[PDB]
Design an enzyme around this catalytic site. Structure first.
Site, PDB file in Angstrom:
ATOM      1  CG  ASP A  63      16.261  76.429  12.976  1.00 17.96           C
ATOM      2  OD1 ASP A  63      15.026  76.608  12.669  1.00 17.96           O
ATOM      3  OD2 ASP A  63      16.656  75.591  13.813  1.00 17.96           O
TER       4      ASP A  63
ATOM      5  CB  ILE B  13      21.056  73.927  30.134  1.00 21.35           C
ATOM      6  CG1 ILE B  13      21.904  74.658  31.171  1.00 21.35           C
ATOM      7  CG2 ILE B  13      20.302  74.906  29.263  1.00 21.35           C
ATOM      8  CD1 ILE B  13      22.917  75.575  30.539  1.00 21.35           C
TER       9      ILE B  13
HETATM   10  C1  LIG Z   1      18.528  79.633  32.409  1.00 21.42           C
HETATM   11  O1  LIG Z   1      17.596  78.796  31.761  1.00 21.42           O
HETATM   12  C2  LIG Z   1      17.944  78.315  30.542  1.00 21.42           C
HETATM   13  C3  LIG Z   1      19.101  78.593  29.885  1.00 21.42           C
HETATM   14  C4  LIG Z   1      19.314  78.064  28.601  1.00 21.42           C
HETATM   15  N1  LIG Z   1      20.499  78.356  27.980  1.00 21.42           N
HETATM   16  C5  LIG Z   1      20.661  77.807  26.777  1.00 21.42           C
HETATM   17  C6  LIG Z   1      21.927  78.044  26.047  1.00 21.42           C
HETATM   18  C7  LIG Z   1      22.179  77.428  24.816  1.00 21.42           C
HETATM   19  C8  LIG Z   1      23.369  77.691  24.165  1.00 21.42           C
HETATM   20  F1  LIG Z   1      23.632  77.081  22.970  1.00 21.42           F
HETATM   21  C9  LIG Z   1      24.337  78.496  24.700  1.00 21.42           C
HETATM   22  C10 LIG Z   1      24.104  79.112  25.899  1.00 21.42           C
HETATM   23  C11 LIG Z   1      22.928  78.845  26.598  1.00 21.42           C
HETATM   24  O2  LIG Z   1      22.740  79.459  27.798  1.00 21.42           O
HETATM   25  N2  LIG Z   1      19.740  77.063  26.111  1.00 21.42           N
HETATM   26  C12 LIG Z   1      18.588  76.795  26.670  1.00 21.42           C
HETATM   27  N3  LIG Z   1      17.698  76.079  25.994  1.00 21.42           N
HETATM   28  C13 LIG Z   1      17.920  75.694  24.606  1.00 21.42           C
HETATM   29  C14 LIG Z   1      17.808  76.866  23.667  1.00 21.42           C
HETATM   30  N4  LIG Z   1      16.394  76.869  23.253  1.00 21.42           N
HETATM   31  C15 LIG Z   1      16.002  75.464  23.110  1.00 21.42           C
HETATM   32  C16 LIG Z   1      16.904  74.672  24.065  1.00 21.42           C
HETATM   33  C17 LIG Z   1      17.591  73.539  23.282  1.00 21.42           C
HETATM   34  C18 LIG Z   1      18.566  72.753  24.126  1.00 21.42           C
HETATM   35  C19 LIG Z   1      16.564  72.615  22.641  1.00 21.42           C
HETATM   36  O3  LIG Z   1      18.385  74.148  22.234  1.00 21.42           O
HETATM   37  C20 LIG Z   1      18.319  77.261  28.001  1.00 21.42           C
HETATM   38  C21 LIG Z   1      17.104  77.027  28.675  1.00 21.42           C
HETATM   39  C22 LIG Z   1      16.933  77.532  29.929  1.00 21.42           C
HETATM   40  O4  LIG Z   1      15.853  77.336  30.707  1.00 21.42           O
HETATM   41  C23 LIG Z   1      14.857  76.407  30.242  1.00 21.42           C
HETATM   42 MG   LIG Z   2      21.271  77.699  12.293  1.00 25.00          MG
END
Ligand SMILES: COc1cc2nc(-c3cc(F)ccc3O)nc(N[C@@H]3CNC[C@H]3C(C)(C)O)c2cc1OC
Ligand SMILES: [Mg+2]
Ligand SMILES: [Mg+2]
Ligand code: NA
EC number: 2.7.11.1
Length: 269
Positions: free
Chosen positions: A131, A15
């Site tokens: 954050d 993801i």
């Molecule tokens: C469907 O597309 C996506 C689903 C996502 N779901 C989660 C996601 C994170 C969780 F902790 C729990 C459930 C989730 O679904 N987190 C994503 N990205 C994370 C959150 N913003 C920054 C990035 C990171 C890894 C740097 O933190 C997703 C990015 C996506 O597309 C780019």
């Molecule tokens: Mg936090």
């Protein structure tokens, strides 16, 4: 295929990754159509990643709210940590903003009502997030009017703060940090309200209310400017202007408090 309790995932199904976590899509091992996100240590920053994922478990396992990402299970060991969370199929607000550039007041209102709902629970539980930013706000399409759901995620920096105490840990993202945080002062739950004000301003205008070339320059800016007034477009509705001016007060004692935020006229139907 790796298993975590009743859940599984493959590391092919990435993801995303940040400095302190790697996230994969997986599923329940019995109910294959139950999708999940599995957050794992980022071994490039092993010690800090492990600490933050442990902190996130401690907080998230206590929170059940439609607008906070649900922790279905977790696995903590001496050298590994996994969180199994509801999958948010809409991605994050930062990517949505990148495409929209700016949001309508009606959209801002819908998202902010949901954020406020989550914040009501945090505040009642004595938890500060520390954050809040678009990258940590996820979107989920779960029938009913305006069914899109916002979910606050990424609680690795969160802490309990007793209501007569102040926090002092310097953590967060500089562009969204309250002045008191980035100036290394004591702070409380109203620091998150500044972060929210910043998010709302960014949704409205496409920009940060106070831009600098670096964290150091932003700090110096806050230090030298005892009064802070963001530039709000003339077309902004009166309730949204008032909300923003009240959230984006430099001095936390003059900043809007939680009760005022939760009942703000901008958030009415
Ligand atoms: C469907 O597309 C996506 C689903 C996502 N779901 C989660 C996601 C994170 C969780 F902790 C729990 C459930 C989730 O679904 N987190 C994503 N990205 C994370 C959150 N913003 C920054 C990035 C990171 C890894 C740097 O933190 C997703 C990015 C996506 O597309 C780019
Ligand atoms: Mg936090
Ligand atoms: Mg404060
Ligand atoms: Na709690």
């Amino acid at each position: 295929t790796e298993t975590v309790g009743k859940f599984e995932f493959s590391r092919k199904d990435l993801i995303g990754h940040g400095a302190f976590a790697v996230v994969f899509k997986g599923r329940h091992r019995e109910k294959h159509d139950l999708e999940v996100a599995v957050k794992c240590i980022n071994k490039k920053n092993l010690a800090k990643s492990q600490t933050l994922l442990g902190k996130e478990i401690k907080i998230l396992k206590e929170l059940k709210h439609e607008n906070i990402v649900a922790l279905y299970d977790f696995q903590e060991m001496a050298n590994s940590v996994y969180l199994v969370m509801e999958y948010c199929n809409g991605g994050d607000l930062a990517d949505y903003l990148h495409a929209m550039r700016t949001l309508s007041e009606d959209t801002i209102r819908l998202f902010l009502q949901q954020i406020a709902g989550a914040m009501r629970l945090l505040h009642s539980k004595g938890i500060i997030h520390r954050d809040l930013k678009p990258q940590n706000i996820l979107l989920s399409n779960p029938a009913n009017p305006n069914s899109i759901r916002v979910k606050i995620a990424d609680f690795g920096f969160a802490r309990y703060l007793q209501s007569n105490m102040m926090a002092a840990t310097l953590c967060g993202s500089p562009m969204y940090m309250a002045p008191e945080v980035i100036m290394s002062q004591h702070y409380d739950g109203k620091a998150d309200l500044w972060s929210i004000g910043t998010i709302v301003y960014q949704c409205l205008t496409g920009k940060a209310p106070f831009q600098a070339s670096s964290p150091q320059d932003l700090r110096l800016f806050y230090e030298k400017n005892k009064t802070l007034v963001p530039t709000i477009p003339a077309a902004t509705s009166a309730p949204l202007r008032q909300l923003l001016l009240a959230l984006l007060q430099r001095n936390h004692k003059d900043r809007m408090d939680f009760d005022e935020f939760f009942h703000h006229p901008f958030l009415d139907a």
